[PDB]
Motif scaffolding. Structure first.
Motif, PDB file in Angstrom:
ATOM      1  N   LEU A  53       0.949  -0.607  -0.049  1.00  0.00           N
ATOM      2  CA  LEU A  53      -0.227   0.234  -0.250  1.00  0.00           C
ATOM      3  C   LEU A  53       0.636   1.101  -0.778  1.00  0.00           C
ATOM      4  O   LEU A  53       1.763   1.682   1.150  1.00  0.00           O
ATOM      5  N   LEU A  54       0.825   1.786  -1.016  1.00  0.00           N
ATOM      6  CA  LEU A  54       1.405   3.263  -1.233  1.00  0.00           C
ATOM      7  C   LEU A  54       1.250   4.646  -0.862  1.00  0.00           C
ATOM      8  O   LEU A  54      -0.441   4.609  -1.626  1.00  0.00           O
ATOM      9  N   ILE A  55       1.733   4.807   0.690  1.00  0.00           N
ATOM     10  CA  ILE A  55       0.637   6.234   0.647  1.00  0.00           C
ATOM     11  C   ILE A  55       1.737   7.533   0.600  1.00  0.00           C
ATOM     12  O   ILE A  55       2.797   7.629   1.323  1.00  0.00           O
ATOM     13  N   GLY A  56       1.042   8.493  -0.818  1.00  0.00           N
ATOM     14  CA  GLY A  56       1.933   9.943  -0.837  1.00  0.00           C
ATOM     15  C   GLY A  56       1.878  11.249  -1.616  1.00  0.00           C
ATOM     16  O   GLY A  56       0.476  10.545  -2.411  1.00  0.00           O
ATOM     17  N   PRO A  57       3.038  12.186  -1.953  1.00  0.00           N
ATOM     18  CA  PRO A  57       1.708  12.906  -2.258  1.00  0.00           C
ATOM     19  C   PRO A  57       1.812  13.134  -4.088  1.00  0.00           C
ATOM     20  O   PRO A  57       1.992  11.915  -4.236  1.00  0.00           O
ATOM     21  N   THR A  58       1.027  13.587  -4.780  1.00  0.00           N
ATOM     22  CA  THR A  58       1.496  13.709  -6.065  1.00  0.00           C
ATOM     23  C   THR A  58       2.437  13.758  -6.583  1.00  0.00           C
ATOM     24  O   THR A  58       3.704  14.053  -6.138  1.00  0.00           O
ATOM     25  N   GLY A  59       2.673  13.217  -7.792  1.00  0.00           N
ATOM     26  CA  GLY A  59       3.883  13.097  -8.395  1.00  0.00           C
ATOM     27  C   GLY A  59       4.900  12.699  -7.697  1.00  0.00           C
ATOM     28  O   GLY A  59       6.613  13.211  -7.726  1.00  0.00           O
ATOM     29  N   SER A  60       5.302  11.686  -6.896  1.00  0.00           N
ATOM     30  CA  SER A  60       6.067  11.372  -5.795  1.00  0.00           C
ATOM     31  C   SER A  60       6.707   9.702  -6.424  1.00  0.00           C
ATOM     32  O   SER A  60       8.127  10.295  -5.666  1.00  0.00           O
ATOM     33  N   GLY A  61       6.334   9.677  -7.463  1.00  0.00           N
ATOM     34  CA  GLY A  61       7.398   8.900  -7.715  1.00  0.00           C
ATOM     35  C   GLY A  61       6.208   6.978  -7.594  1.00  0.00           C
ATOM     36  O   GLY A  61       6.782   6.114  -7.881  1.00  0.00           O
ATOM     37  N   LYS A  62       4.957   7.536  -7.391  1.00  0.00           N
ATOM     38  CA  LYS A  62       4.818   6.247  -6.924  1.00  0.00           C
ATOM     39  C   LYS A  62       4.239   5.246  -8.229  1.00  0.00           C
ATOM     40  O   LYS A  62       4.641   4.106  -8.288  1.00  0.00           O
ATOM     41  N   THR A  63       4.184   5.735  -9.562  1.00  0.00           N
ATOM     42  CA  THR A  63       3.854   5.015 -10.888  1.00  0.00           C
ATOM     43  C   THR A  63       5.269   4.048 -10.870  1.00  0.00           C
ATOM     44  O   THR A  63       5.288   3.020 -11.401  1.00  0.00           O
ATOM     45  N   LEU A  64       6.259   5.141 -10.886  1.00  0.00           N
ATOM     46  CA  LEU A  64       7.084   4.954 -11.173  1.00  0.00           C
ATOM     47  C   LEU A  64       7.812   3.558 -11.110  1.00  0.00           C
ATOM     48  O   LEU A  64       8.819   3.014 -11.831  1.00  0.00           O
ATOM     49  N   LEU A  65       7.771   3.723  -9.258  1.00  0.00           N
ATOM     50  CA  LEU A  65       8.190   2.350  -8.370  1.00  0.00           C
ATOM     51  C   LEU A  65       8.372   1.486  -9.273  1.00  0.00           C
ATOM     52  O   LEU A  65       8.443   0.294  -9.798  1.00  0.00           O
ATOM     53  N   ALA A  66       6.313   0.745  -9.984  1.00  0.00           N
ATOM     54  CA  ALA A  66       5.696  -0.148 -10.388  1.00  0.00           C
ATOM     55  C   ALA A  66       6.169  -0.317 -11.740  1.00  0.00           C
ATOM     56  O   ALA A  66       6.740  -1.680 -11.304  1.00  0.00           O
ATOM     57  N   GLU A  67       6.365  -0.021 -12.589  1.00  0.00           N
ATOM     58  CA  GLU A  67       7.047  -0.478 -13.737  1.00  0.00           C
ATOM     59  C   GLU A  67       8.239  -0.295 -13.824  1.00  0.00           C
ATOM     60  O   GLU A  67       9.134  -1.052 -14.224  1.00  0.00           O
ATOM     61  N   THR A  68       9.401   0.530 -13.044  1.00  0.00           N
ATOM     62  CA  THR A  68      10.730  -0.112 -12.811  1.00  0.00           C
ATOM     63  C   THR A  68      11.161  -1.044 -12.195  1.00  0.00           C
ATOM     64  O   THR A  68      11.816  -1.931 -12.342  1.00  0.00           O
ATOM     65  N   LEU A  69      10.479  -1.993 -11.642  1.00  0.00           N
ATOM     66  CA  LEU A  69      11.005  -3.459 -11.020  1.00  0.00           C
ATOM     67  C   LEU A  69      10.097  -4.381 -12.554  1.00  0.00           C
ATOM     68  O   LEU A  69      11.166  -4.629 -12.031  1.00  0.00           O
ATOM     69  N   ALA A  70       9.331  -3.702 -13.063  1.00  0.00           N
ATOM     70  CA  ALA A  70       9.001  -4.679 -13.724  1.00  0.00           C
ATOM     71  C   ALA A  70      10.239  -4.402 -15.303  1.00  0.00           C
ATOM     72  O   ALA A  70       9.931  -6.083 -15.801  1.00  0.00           O
ATOM     73  N   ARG A  71      11.019  -3.647 -14.936  1.00  0.00           N
ATOM     74  CA  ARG A  71      12.329  -3.855 -16.502  1.00  0.00           C
ATOM     75  C   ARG A  71      13.301  -4.584 -15.516  1.00  0.00           C
ATOM     76  O   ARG A  71      13.361  -5.128 -16.453  1.00  0.00           O
ATOM     77  N   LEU A  72      13.558  -4.563 -14.569  1.00  0.00           N
ATOM     78  CA  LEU A  72      14.269  -5.058 -13.766  1.00  0.00           C
ATOM     79  C   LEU A  72      14.363  -6.751 -13.902  1.00  0.00           C
ATOM     80  O   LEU A  72      15.019  -7.649 -14.882  1.00  0.00           O
ATOM     81  N   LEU A  73      13.155  -7.059 -13.167  1.00  0.00           N
ATOM     82  CA  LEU A  73      12.584  -8.162 -14.136  1.00  0.00           C
ATOM     83  C   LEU A  73      10.930  -8.190 -14.596  1.00  0.00           C
ATOM     84  O   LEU A  73       9.962  -8.558 -14.448  1.00  0.00           O
ATOM     85  N   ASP A  74      11.492  -8.864 -16.443  1.00  0.00           N
ATOM     86  CA  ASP A  74      10.677  -8.794 -17.290  1.00  0.00           C
ATOM     87  C   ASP A  74       8.838  -9.625 -17.005  1.00  0.00           C
ATOM     88  O   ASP A  74       9.534 -10.905 -16.373  1.00  0.00           O
ATOM     89  N   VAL A  75       8.513  -8.588 -16.644  1.00  0.00           N
ATOM     90  CA  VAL A  75       6.892  -9.661 -16.160  1.00  0.00           C
ATOM     91  C   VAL A  75       6.094  -8.436 -16.551  1.00  0.00           C
ATOM     92  O   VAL A  75       6.006  -7.194 -16.812  1.00  0.00           O
ATOM     93  N   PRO A  76       5.023  -8.762 -16.946  1.00  0.00           N
ATOM     94  CA  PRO A  76       3.361  -7.402 -18.093  1.00  0.00           C
ATOM     95  C   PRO A  76       3.495  -6.657 -16.270  1.00  0.00           C
ATOM     96  O   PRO A  76       2.690  -7.442 -15.687  1.00  0.00           O
ATOM     97  N   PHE A  77       3.296  -5.579 -16.484  1.00  0.00           N
ATOM     98  CA  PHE A  77       2.432  -4.510 -16.350  1.00  0.00           C
ATOM     99  C   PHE A  77       1.899  -3.768 -16.914  1.00  0.00           C
ATOM    100  O   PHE A  77       1.346  -3.579 -17.955  1.00  0.00           O
ATOM    101  N   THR A  78       0.463  -3.353 -15.493  1.00  0.00           N
ATOM    102  CA  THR A  78      -0.723  -2.806 -15.856  1.00  0.00           C
ATOM    103  C   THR A  78      -0.961  -1.646 -14.881  1.00  0.00           C
ATOM    104  O   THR A  78      -0.573  -1.513 -13.613  1.00  0.00           O
ATOM    105  N   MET A  79      -1.748  -0.620 -15.125  1.00  0.00           N
ATOM    106  CA  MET A  79      -2.159   0.185 -14.423  1.00  0.00           C
ATOM    107  C   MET A  79      -3.879   0.642 -14.517  1.00  0.00           C
ATOM    108  O   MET A  79      -4.300   0.250 -15.471  1.00  0.00           O
ATOM    109  N   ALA A  80      -4.002   0.911 -13.680  1.00  0.00           N
ATOM    110  CA  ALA A  80      -5.560   1.085 -13.224  1.00  0.00           C
ATOM    111  C   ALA A  80      -6.781   2.415 -11.988  1.00  0.00           C
ATOM    112  O   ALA A  80      -5.326   3.270 -11.802  1.00  0.00           O
ATOM    113  N   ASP A  81      -7.091   2.688 -12.463  1.00  0.00           N
ATOM    114  CA  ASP A  81      -7.484   4.000 -11.655  1.00  0.00           C
ATOM    115  C   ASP A  81      -8.660   3.690 -10.515  1.00  0.00           C
ATOM    116  O   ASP A  81      -9.881   3.085 -11.569  1.00  0.00           O
ATOM    117  N   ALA A  82      -8.799   4.218  -9.277  1.00  0.00           N
ATOM    118  CA  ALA A  82     -10.312   3.949  -8.153  1.00  0.00           C
ATOM    119  C   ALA A  82     -11.441   4.838  -8.895  1.00  0.00           C
ATOM    120  O   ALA A  82     -12.172   4.358  -9.198  1.00  0.00           O
TER     121      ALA A  82
END
Ligand SMILES: Nc1ncnc2c1ncn2[C@@H]1O[C@H](COP(=O)(O)OP(=O)(O)O)[C@@H](O)[C@H]1O
Ligand SMILES: Nc1ncnc2c1ncn2[C@@H]1O[C@H](COP(=O)(O)OP(=O)(O)O)[C@@H](O)[C@H]1O
Lengths: 338, 191, 166, 192, 111, 99, 56, 56, 44
Positions: A53-82
């Motif tokens: 559960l990521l709790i941070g301000p806007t534009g703090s890097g929450k989304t960037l941390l998600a895809e960066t991990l997928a780039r290291l270990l190749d796996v599919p990555f998808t985003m969604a909005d509540a």
């Protein structure tokens, strides 16, 4: 599967200023991948998924941390909005669609798709449509999802591919702006209006970072989150804020830095690009004024270089170009070398 | 007409009067002449806040030209009885009864504004009737005087003899004078 | 145990038919109500599935339809209606379906009372049309007729506030 | 009576009071004889606004004939204590105590209407009793007189000697004269 | 059952079910008996204004008005074998008996 | 019926899919043994009751205590077993390490 | 506009915004952000893939 | 444009149209440009009970 | 339908253990069993 220390090292190159959150993400994501690495689970004991559960301000890097991990270990990555699911109508169709989007990048492979890393943002907004949480928690529990194979005009009911979300890692990011007040009321003095009350809202934001680290389930229920949803998110990583000094670093220090990207475009043009240290803070000052964090950095530099990009090709024999704080302000024009 | 303020939180929006909104922040407003009814209201606020949280400090704004002695003792005893430390801030002025409650606050949590005026005097009373009844009431009020002086000496830290000579007649004091006298701990000049 | 014995009565040497008896698990949240349902699928031979009552809504509305419950049970049963009829079902969060206080009924509650009215015939047993896969109820000719007479139902919910009533 | 007003916000329609609506916009109304009861109400309003936004300014509208010094002095100390600047506007009139609060406003933000009348005088009080008590109360009021004149000189900028002579008796000052004396800064003739 | 043009099942689906029992024999189905349970559920919620359309309720009742007395219903030709050449079967419900039944909760208060 | 503090302690060890066994299994496959002492188990249950998270909260409490060691355990070498005590549960004390 | 609207005050020293100078399509679309486009219905991933924005 | 498998249209046909203009040359085709007018019209909408499915 | 609930409660305990029990040929239910004070008599 690199070690937790190795994962943090790779994350440091791509992201900075979130070392504490990186450790939580590194150890948690490592265990989930290790669970997948040990997916056989020959023993009767079955390991349980640990949702972050990521709790941070806007534009703090929450989304960037998600895809960066997928780039290291190749796996599919998808985003969604509540917010997209706020309608509360046929929520089942929308959530399974998230798996369909993931399958598009996973070559419609159930095994490969199960290892994907899903990310969600703006979770605080749904807290109060309450119904979406009732349906959303089921997705985190892990349930089979019937998805048609590679679209198709029509297919039998059994033909639909079935993907179990029990093995998928879900990261429900969010930005709880008002939660800081709830924590201060529970930790600091209850008074917030009296003379003795600490109303020193200097807006420095340094204190909020430590305050958010003390997040507990009690403050979440006050925010409107149901206890059942909170229980399925045991791991919590907190991003304090992106500092003005850090913003200057983000401009140039990251591998795919904004300055390097523009320099590359100018490099092939045949003219060198330079940014003075004073110019970098100007971009940070403009970015902080916008309040969009690192997101604004791209727009500020793009506008500054819009005029030169249009006219520099017409200009000939320009050996190099330099930018200063005045140029970012717009009062001046960047220096031209011949 | 007291104004209404809206408190906005994730759960929803609620409307409260200015006095009730500040009550949530453990702020009690002692104002006007002290009496049984107003004092009872302040006591109810202290017990209510004690129940909500017995650890958080309570603030008390004192602005009053004294009042009934019996009503004042109820407030003073209540503050000492409850575990939370009751802070006292003098706004405008604090007469005999107001000053007794002001100095009665928790050690190190007694404040006063720079232009506040603090006045202390001995109790005032009267009785009409037979000489025998007069002797009874005269002894009662004198016992109250000695008791109040003893309590004031304890909080202020001044000797009982010094408190007696000073409280024989009206003694107006200023915020800086109160600090050295011991009635208050510090002055809140600016934030 | 009784569920399996009822299946054993298919021979029907005697005309008497063994009617089912549904369960109503009422307990506080975090007491293992959902866990009990998940711990039965491991050993259960017949198809078992789990659903959520909050998502369900009255027919003719954009929320959902109660017939979708059978779709989930068909996934485990390989879409075989013969064996799906002998399955078991679990419905969670049934407490939210309760009628609101002093409702004049002009509101026409869809999330609550409407769901109960549709489930009545479903629990007691009736042929229910089921879409083939992920489709809304419509004039589409293809529909799966699944009888719920033998499909046991276990409704589990946390009736918050019921303690005060008792 | 007070007329209710509706505020249109995304949350929904909200029925506010005329005074409560203005309080939401950092506007405080100081009207009538200054007393302990109304002063505590103004103090609560100030503290509440400070918590919501200590950066934004506060506008205090003063239309009163004056009153008690102790009660009025609790508002002055509150204004100086809080971080946000307190702008003071004079409507109709501002007597001795109303004028002290008016000039006590933030430098450069004090305003006055063109037809407003600002009157300043020295403190007045009385005591009855023995000669010994009279000496105590007589010394107290004189100290207050010097204290009030010292602060009034600070805001207006005039020397203590001039303020003492001018405030020895009732002195009526028009809106333009107040600017020269230093009680206020500008006159709000028309919206620009 | 819901009003036409909505996600809920159409009223004509009842005639189709009767045909299934009759092996899609219109003559047998035309003389068949029909039962409609929970008829009380499709009732107006004591709101004569009818501000909002009660598709599942009042709408069903309005559609059923002509079916009970008799109408040339339309249903798939034979078990929905294929969409081409629909030739929807015509079934007259003028002689089809209908037996509605339901538990009217609250009717005692009215009486 | 609702769960009790002693029942929560039992749930930590007695169930077949007990949380203690799950974390121990994660450590065991890595090659390091893990052991949960009685003092630590009771403290964990108290934290859940203190935060009112309940049975589901057990995962969160264990996650915090083992957050530091899980991160550094793969990097470290010659670690035969890790031990947790009540002091580590609150967080003031470091995790006991056996080589 | 709902996101960038400061609002009109009521006091004497506040700034009143008349309907004549309320706002216009020009200078308003220039401040477009991805969050507002999502409310319109566009997918966030689609917006991210379109960094260049030409506003007329 | 509509979802694949429907009577309206298929998105994949856009690439074929670009080839017809370039005479089906993969080399020059990759250097082409596309202009999708009325893009906002396909903005996401809530589910409708009457409509079978939201193809657009 | 209420009748089923009453009988289920009365026969809950016997049905739970009667299959496991041995040499049991018949069971009897009396008025006391409905009240719950006594357990159904078992015939061996
Ligand atoms: N340390 C960093 N290095 C490089 N880029 C960053 C860094 N932090 C933030 N960013 C940029 O800021 C953007 C923030 O995106 P996102 O996380 O989706 O915003 P939000 O967290 O508000 O939803 C990212 O696209 C990323 O490129
Ligand atoms: N005795 C127990 N042993 C292990 N886990 C339990 C026990 N009781 C409850 N739980 C926990 O409760 C959770 C399931 O409860 P939950 O789904 O919240 O019930 P409901 O949703 O019906 O309120 C599981 O995650 C499980 O770990």
């Amino acid at each position: 599967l690199p070690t937790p220390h190795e994962i943090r090292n790779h994350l440091d190159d791509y992201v900075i200023g979130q070392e504490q959150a990186k450790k939580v993400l590194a150890v948690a994501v490592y265990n989930h991948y290790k669970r997948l690495r040990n997916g056989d689970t020959s023993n009767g004991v079955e390991l349980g998924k640990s949702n972050i559960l990521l709790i941070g301000p806007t534009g703090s890097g929450k989304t960037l941390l998600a895809e960066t991990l997928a780039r290291l270990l190749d796996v599919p990555f998808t985003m969604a909005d509540a917010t997209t699911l706020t309608e509360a109508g046929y929520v089942g169709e929308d959530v399974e669609n998230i798996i369909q989007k993931l399958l598009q990048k996973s070559d419609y492979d159930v095994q490969k798709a199960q290892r994907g890393i899903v990310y969600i943002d703006e979770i605080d907004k749904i807290s109060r449509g309450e119904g979406v949480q009732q349906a959303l928690l089921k997705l985190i529990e892990g349930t089979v999802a019937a998805v048609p194979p590679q679209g198709g005009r029509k297919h039998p009911q059994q033909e639909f591919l079935q993907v179990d979300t029990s093995k998928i890692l879900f990261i429900c990011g969010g930005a709880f702006a008002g939660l800081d007040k709830v924590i201060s009321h529970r930790v600091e003095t209850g008074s917030g209006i009296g003379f003795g009350a600490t109303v020193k809202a200097k807006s420095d934001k340094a204190s909020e970072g430590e305050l958010l680290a003390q997040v507990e389930p009690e403050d979440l229920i006050k925010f409107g989150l149901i206890p059942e949803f909170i229980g399925r998110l045991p791991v919590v990583a907190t991003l304090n804020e992106l500092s003005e000094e850090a913003l200057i670093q983000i401009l140039k220090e990251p591998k795919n830095a904004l300055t390097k990207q523009y320099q590359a475009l100018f490099n092939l043009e045949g003219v060198d690009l330079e940014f003075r240290d004073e110019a970098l803070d100007a971009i940070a000052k403009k970015a902080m004024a916008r309040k969009t964090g690192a997101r604004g950095l791209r727009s500020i530099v793009e506008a500054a270089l819009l005029d030169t990009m249009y006219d520099l090709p017409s200009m000939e024999d320009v050996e190099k170009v330099v930018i200063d704080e005045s140029v970012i302000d717009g009062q001046s024009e960047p220096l031209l070398i011949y | 007409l007291v104004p209404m303020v809206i408190e906005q939180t994730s759960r929803g929006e609620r409307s409260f009067d200015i006095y009730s909104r500040l009550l949530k922040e453990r702020v009690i407003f002692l104002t006007g002449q002290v009496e049984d009814h107003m004092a009872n209201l302040i006591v109810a606020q202290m017990l209510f806040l004690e129940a909500e949280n017995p650890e958080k400090d309570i603030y008390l704004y004192i602005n009053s030209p004294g009042g009934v002695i019996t009503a004042g003792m109820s407030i003073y005893d209540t503050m000492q009885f409850i575990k939370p430390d009751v802070s006292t801030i003098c706004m405008g002025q604090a007469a005999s009864m107001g000053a007794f409650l002001l100095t009665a606050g928790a050690k190190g949590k007694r404040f006063c504004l720079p232009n506040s005026r603090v006045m202390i005097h001995q109790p005032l009373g009267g009785y009409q009737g037979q000489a025998t009844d007069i002797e009874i009431h005269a002894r009662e009020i004198l016992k109250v005087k000695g008791r109040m002086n003893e309590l004031m000496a304890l909080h202020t830290g001044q000797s009982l003899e010094q408190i007696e000579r000073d409280t024989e007649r009206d003694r107006f004091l200023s915020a800086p004078e109160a600090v050295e006298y011991g009635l208050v701990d510090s002055i809140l000049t600016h934030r | 145990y009784n569920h399996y014995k009822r299946l054993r009565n298919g021979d029907t040497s005697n005309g008497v038919e063994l009617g089912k008896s549904n369960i109503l698990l009422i307990g506080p949240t975090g007491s293992g109500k959902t866990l009990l349902a998940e711990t039965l699928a491991r050993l259960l031979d017949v198809p078992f599935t789990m659903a959520d009552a909050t998502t369900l809504t009255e027919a003719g509305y954009v929320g959902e339809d109660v017939e979708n419950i059978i779709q989930k049970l068909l996934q485990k049963s390989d879409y075989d209606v013969q064996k799906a009829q002998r399955g078991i079902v679990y419905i969670d969060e049934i407490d939210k379906i309760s009628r609101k206080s002093d409702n004049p009924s002009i509101t026409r509650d869809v999330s609550g009372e409407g769901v109960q009215q549709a489930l009545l015939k479903l629990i007691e047993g009736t042929v229910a049309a089921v879409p083939p896969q992920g489709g809304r109820k419509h004039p589409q000719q293809e529909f799966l007729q699944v009888d719920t007479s033998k499909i046991l139902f276990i409704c589990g919910g946390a009736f918050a506030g019921l303690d005060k009533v008792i």
